[model samples]
Target chain A: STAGKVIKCKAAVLWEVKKPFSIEDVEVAPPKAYEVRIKMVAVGICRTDDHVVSGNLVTPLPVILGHEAAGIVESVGEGVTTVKPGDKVIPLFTPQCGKCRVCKNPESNYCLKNDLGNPRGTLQDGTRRFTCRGKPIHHFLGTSTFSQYTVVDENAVAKIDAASPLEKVCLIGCGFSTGYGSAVNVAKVTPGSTCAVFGLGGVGLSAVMGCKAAGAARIIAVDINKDKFAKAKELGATECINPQDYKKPIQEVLKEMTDGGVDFSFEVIGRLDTMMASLLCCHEACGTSVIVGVPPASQNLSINPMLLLTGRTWKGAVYGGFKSKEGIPKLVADFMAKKFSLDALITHVLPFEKINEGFDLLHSGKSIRTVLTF
Target chain B: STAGKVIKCKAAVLWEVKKPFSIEDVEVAPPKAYEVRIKMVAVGICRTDDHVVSGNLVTPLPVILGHEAAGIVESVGEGVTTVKPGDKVIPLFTPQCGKCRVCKNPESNYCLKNDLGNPRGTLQDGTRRFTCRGKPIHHFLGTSTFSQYTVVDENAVAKIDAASPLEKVCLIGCGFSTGYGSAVNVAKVTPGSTCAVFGLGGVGLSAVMGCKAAGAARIIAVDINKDKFAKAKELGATECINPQDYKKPIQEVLKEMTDGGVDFSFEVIGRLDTMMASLLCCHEACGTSVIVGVPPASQNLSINPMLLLTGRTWKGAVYGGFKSKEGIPKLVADFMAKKFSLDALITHVLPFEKINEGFDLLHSGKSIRTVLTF
Candidate 1:
């Protein structure tokens, strides 16, 4: 039985940066103590996935890549108590241990056990549960959703409703929740306020939906790509504008559109310039700007402190500031209750074998999200 | 009558950068429409007043430069309805025009009528109110309380209790409010939290008092001068540390003192380095850093956006985010109720003619606040 033995499965491995993921057969070992093995059903192509492939984000090489995915628990380890075999689960990129200092604090959700800081590419015990062609492949973000069978720490797995659609709710594993929560939880957008969302990607569009949900009087979606405007409008944007359409800076354009500037602004593009632009386009006295994108790991921005001294608030969060195990289930339930729809976010669905083609769609900016079915 | 004609008064004027103030007799003009003329009682020496003289804060020269003061209104302009003759008031560098969009929004207090953005150093009608030796003199921050008598727009005046002591309550106009309200109103620090106040000046010490008032469990005061530590401790700092005492960076030393880092950090020195240090020393996941000092206008700080990405919040405010005309009077009432004391803040009291000696004490770091009596 696969429960206590090595199981053969398909996985997409990245041997190095600036290269596409390689689909190959790999062996996944059984779950260790306090771990669980999941059979991944679907994964979504997120910008962070390509950020590593393009070498913008640095991590261990020869590693499994996908982090935004949903699946079913195949087996539980010796000490696993939260979930059992056949339970539906979603792997969290940002884990919540509920024991660390950050977890115990009500104001933050970033867990102390996160491996992203020093990135050893191994589980908590410093060992790999994956092997490919007689070589041990490193894990990615602790979950490694690119693999068909993945072993993760119990803390990183969230149990959801069995009736939830794996293919759709999978987006909730990262992009949707990140953008939406940035508005509702992080920004705390209030009614009758104006909001501006830069970059009309999956995450940005989700921010638009969130601003609308929070009762924002106006939601302005901005992007250089003209094609994404129609979809942005459908998602909840009161209006859409192209940055290229104006000769002035986007921040200036936004200031002109709103009386002084927007009440809230979000930068989901991950570029340093856009981050600065987002901060500048907000009202100097009371506007709040949130950084929702992942910038290049090694880069920095130069800012005048006077920008904040005049009364602007700048903040940011990872995974939309949601406590993974606790928040994901409620979001899954909300999806089931028809509070919001994920249909507009997903523009393409592809077989898991065409993962490279999915990356092409993202690189060409032709798709918001490409869900890969196993 | 002097009410409708010019009155000769003594004022300290800065003829150029890097020069001491000159006490000269200048002709004070009568108040125009919607303006009020006041006879200053006591003025406190603030860092910003020196910043302009030191060439750090740029503005028009030949200007009178005190913004923190309490005075009695001499006369009211034609359209003024708020204050009449003999009313005790504080001149606000940051005015509150209740009709402006920001003032009405309830979240912000920066009035659009402020002369700070593009300082012409004149009244609303584009004319000078002071003439020295037949040459027109410029006003600083519109308050210009360095003079015995000054004229300001009605919106920039806050009427205080008639029984309030002008000498002690004068600091309520700027220093005390900017630092105290930064904790109570801006940071909104919580109970049982740790806070670090950088640069033990008047503002920093006030911030320490505010932290204690807000029930912070630990307040760490930081400064280069050992002389300030005793005052800081008396004002409610649980402990004080000199950055030079540590071999490593101050941020590193703070992290070791407080587990992870403090919940709130205040930068009151206004240097770019200290601003960055204040931000970096806060808890990465939940701590908030506030900019309370006036930085050099042309300089900037380089920071990694990833610092914010992990969940830290950075913010700043002018006059501690208080709605000048609305909040200052209540603060004066609080002072009258024995809620706080301003005695420790005033280290020196001098006649208005000894204004140069007051600047000398500030430059030598021997005084927290020097009250110049007119």
Candidate 2:
């Protein structure tokens, strides 16, 4: 236990839209009654971070934006029991309050308690924990892990095994869990099934691993770039295809490769056209296409309704359909027990000062994941 | 079963698109192996019939265009065993061959054996049966009941109770079966759940009947035309709504009416925007939106992929997801037991000569169903 006090830390603050993040010394305050403070050790740069930078999805400016992160618990409020001081933890973007209707339901992990009106870009308590240049900096996705320290509701924190390294485990905070869970949990990829994965990024590789763990007979990895193919195959992809090589659409190529189409298809790239390709490349009867990519807020995704009429499911998943606080623990155990290959995904490891370079690598498609360790 | 011979009959033939059917003397061919001949009893006009008239969905020129009808079994082919002479039957557009991959699966009633090419607008065998003025007229769907008699594969016919009023049960042929089975079978609405139905036509009213049959706590009926609301309420819709009355989008209005949204939503109108409304108006978690109406083949259905991420399902059904040979028998038995209000649905009963007037009644949108008696 600790007395209520303000803590000073170094953080990447987003002060303006369409501009580079500014690194500055910031002040983070204490946890409230149901909150816990985190000392972030390693944070991963996700494509969503780039989305925030370009302002596709709106969030308040002058805020800290980092969701995929792993760290150690610094302190906890009196009501917090999930994590304590010196405990290994990862912050979640989608919080699981456990008491909500969706959290209680077995089929769904979508919690209703998360502040949908998060326009203020603040925490669950609706106030900035971060203060930089004498102004309060808003939270990002309730995590704000770009900061050296962050205070969040206890529900948003997942306490993992301390034996696992923070840098490696941080991959589980978002993309890996999303792709892996989408296959095993959402799509429920069966043994001997054929799978197709779109976008050979960190998330797509994780899905390949998930498909492998689920005992998929054939994993078809699709991407515009041929560079990601080797790692995709190493993970699980049995067939690698570049859409540019074929004159026809990728879905047609995929359908002809498998009988009709693959049993499971995934869209890891956040684009409607790619999602349609993933959907059209599913088996006609009882096929499921899972959308793991974060789509823009107000864009329309056009699809032929007849595609679904034949029993192909069009589904989307956040955090790989995991119940965050409840499901992440089991996943961490599986990660330790060799369920997924996290190393293949972590292509580059950079220091906190080189975090901005990690974004460059991400946009260039040169790296799957670039972990920035403080 | 002993002899097969060609016969002549009075039939209404579609010589061209966007033109009224012309009554003519047509030669009927003998049933092939496993086929049966049916003496038309009564045919219920359906909206899809109007769709064919508009040439939006192309049909081979000089074809017979009535798919939903009840008839008396005239004769059976050498190999036919499912139905015999003197047996009352309902022919299906979506047949249950029992041997197809989809028919074999319990979850799906859509048979894959029904001639994918759909050539010559003929039977599943791809051969024309009716010849008008010495020129062959192709069949519409599988059942061309606009003729006095029709020949179809025994597998494409659902043999119902002979005592059941043929005119009343023929509504079971298309719209009734489509809407009823969509809710009871496909959506699988649980007891004590709330439901929302879009479109107040024959299909939507039947969906309300299905919701009530499934023991739903409340049924919200949505239609642009408020006049259909009374009939909708009579068929089990507990609440009626006119989207014009609401300043907001219909989905927003529905979401507010229910706690978040309804447990089940049905889109009985073929419009993409209405289908979107039904999907958007679904409960945040565990809500299912079943598409009961057939939208235009080339029309693009634009949807936000994020809608499905929150645990809502988008699905469509052909013939209301009912296996023609297998499911229709049970539905007929239920109808005989007074499980559904078929009489309320049959608002107009006219002679076969008034078929053109029946089309007028349907276009005026004042009648739920107009059954033409032979």
Candidate 3:
């Protein structure tokens, strides 16, 4: 019955490398087999999308670019029991297929079947549901919410409260979860402990929020830009240091401030020097530095082995160690309970047409999180 | 108290840099507060001493060099309660002062106040207890058992069973403890797991023994020397790979042998390339590589952050992660129970006057452990 009606929707498409997203009319395909067709209401611009645009993160070009989004389920495919039409939901980049090995393991954050390249929004089978000019179009991150209407696996969609505003809840899909989880889940910042977060961008600020929520005694924010300090303090930083200004070694400064050194330090900048400094800024014993940023492929981290022998640990974190399905609901619940400061973090809100402008603002370092509404 | 008795002893002394030990007559001093003077029955030569002599490890010159030793306590000073005169004991380079913070912590092997610069084997009151020609000489690792009579802090001595052979038990003071503990303690190799050890030196072969004791299913010993293959196999290495002939990457060789990669890999060689290969040979998830060998001070470990994210851990083991007071007794008990092959590891025995010749054997790679008998 729906095959006769033509559904034309606006989508932000990347036609080539190093180019901005161009608006195009993309035909929407009805859901099939444990899949759900969503009408995206709001989407958030994330650094990961920027990586794809700048050719830093490898992905097929001419693909839909947005991953962090919230939408209403317009239809459901056969065998889809988890979600139904008219359900409000948030999309996940890594779907929690509950039967997979990683999903079943209590400690793993890795999703087993997330093959991001073949973006037709179908399951493991190689059939494409979304087509342009009778040719299959690749999906991005399994949740191609850059389009006005997108199709995704049922496991990738988490049903949220219909009363919650889609524009506000959209950020929970990626940036907020990653930043907050890095502190609470991965680093496990203990009460009355001191912590330092390098880079006061979106991820770093959310880590500050997580530290505050975790009852950390002193939250020190580090950034090269002096202007970011004020916002960082507002977000929960007790003290902020500009690494460029320290006359002595940064480790010495950190040591003096925390009476020895921070109990935990996070490297959010992804630079090798910053990562090494993060490791060195830990206290004598039980200091752990977590790497949250993804550096370029050719870059390598070098450190003195003596520091590790002295009881310091260096680790890496992905998505803040958040298990998407279990963690997303908890995050949404926390937001509804007024426990998290999601409202304060969003600095700009624009229409879907102004997505490029939001990215430009991100490049200018003027916006914390720029959300695009339908 | 025999304080007025003048005693002369033959000591192995390095006269200059890069030179062999010279047997010379040295005068000894009586024990002072919290110190004990020992008549060394036997001392084990370790590779660390070789590094110290070769200028790889920086230390003061003209030093009396032997740390791994077993002896009979000749006398005890005032306030010494741990050990008394005529007790059979093993001297430790790293002392476990039980009252320190690290001693109190469950996970730490670091003892804060011990094993600093080779203290003039005097009491804390700052007066030399050992003298040569009426001039105070510094102790090597606080237990310079290269000489017949050596004085050390009572905290540095561990009282062992009298029935155990001093020559065999002395090696447990450093090399044996270092290798065995690296597998059982630092890396914590699980039972039925696969482990690969780089280099077939005393430390590497002992790691094989430790792995076997820990119930490792497959123990792969990798080295360039074909002669060590037989000894490694006898010591419990299930398989041996000569790195010279096996042109494939060590990781690939290990992967093919173990059906994947090893659960734990140890870098006992301390060379940069071997360290990298040791890390690369670890399994994808839950594999750990323990670096027991100390490379040059200028050397740095270079690694990609992705390896850490994938659940591979790199850790350093110092003094075999041993708390000398507690660890020495257990190692001796294990040796007594015939659980470890300590006697098989000792390749040569020489008089204290032939300490230089023992070091020459170590230089030629002909000896696993050489003991200097008084």
Task: Give the candidate number with the greatest lDDT.
Answer: 1
Q: List residue ranges in candidate 1 displaced over 4 A.
A: none
At residue A125, candidate 2 shows an lDDT of 66
On DockQ, who's better, 2 or 3?
A: 2
* Reference contacts reproduced by model 3: 0.32
Give the per-prediction TM-score of chain B: 0.98, 0.95, 0.94
For candidate 3, the docking band is acceptable
**Per-candidate total of colliding backbone pairs:** 0, 1, 2
**TM-score (all chains, Cα) for each model:** 0.99, 0.93, 0.87
State the lDDT of candidate 1 residue by residue for B1-374, as single tens digits. Answer: 57998999899989988877899999998999999999999999999998999888888879999999999999999989999999999999988988988888887877777877678898766777999998999988898999999999998999999999999999999999999999988999899999999989988899999999999999999999999999999999999999888789999999988988999999999899999889999999999999999898789788999999889999998888899998999999999999999999999999999999999999998999999998
Interface RMSD (Å), every candidate? 0.7, 2.0, 2.5
Extract clashing residue pairs from model 1.
none
- Estimate, for each residue in A1-374, the C-alpha lDDT of model 3 and write its tens digit: 34224457788878887888888777877776888888888998888788778876676656787888999888887898987778889988877788854566565565666654223444445554456656566688778888888888878779887677788889889888888888898778988878999988777888899889899999999988898888998889998988789789887899888766788899876677888788888866557788887665556777666676555666665667777777887788878888766876788999999989999998988888888999
| True-vs-predicted CA distance for residue A367, candidate 1, Å | 0.9
Proportion of true inter-chain contacts also present in candidate 2: 0.59
lDDT of 2 by residue, B1-374 (tens): 42377888788887877888787888899888889999988999998888778765666777887878898888898889888899988888877888865676677766776642243587877788888787878887777899888998878898899797898888888888888888888889888889999988888888888889899999999888888988888778888988888789999988888878888999987888988888899876668888877677688876777787667777776777787888788888988898665888888999887888999988888788899888
- For this target, which candidate reaches the highest TM-score against the unseen true structure? 1
Instruction: Give the 10-residue window scoring lowest on summed lDDT in candidate 1 chain A.
Output: A110-119
Tens-digit per-residue lDDT, A1-374, candidate 2:
34478888789888888888778999988888988988889999988888888877788878888889898888898888778798999888888987865776677777775643235688776677878778888887888889888898888888899798788989999888888888998889988888998989988899999999899999989899899999988888998999998899989988888867888898888887888788888877667788888787778877777777767767666777888987888888987998655788888999898777888898888999999999
**Ranking of all predicted structures according to DockQ, beginning with the best and ending with the worst:** 1, 2, 3
Worst 10 residues of 2 chain A by lDDT: A111-120
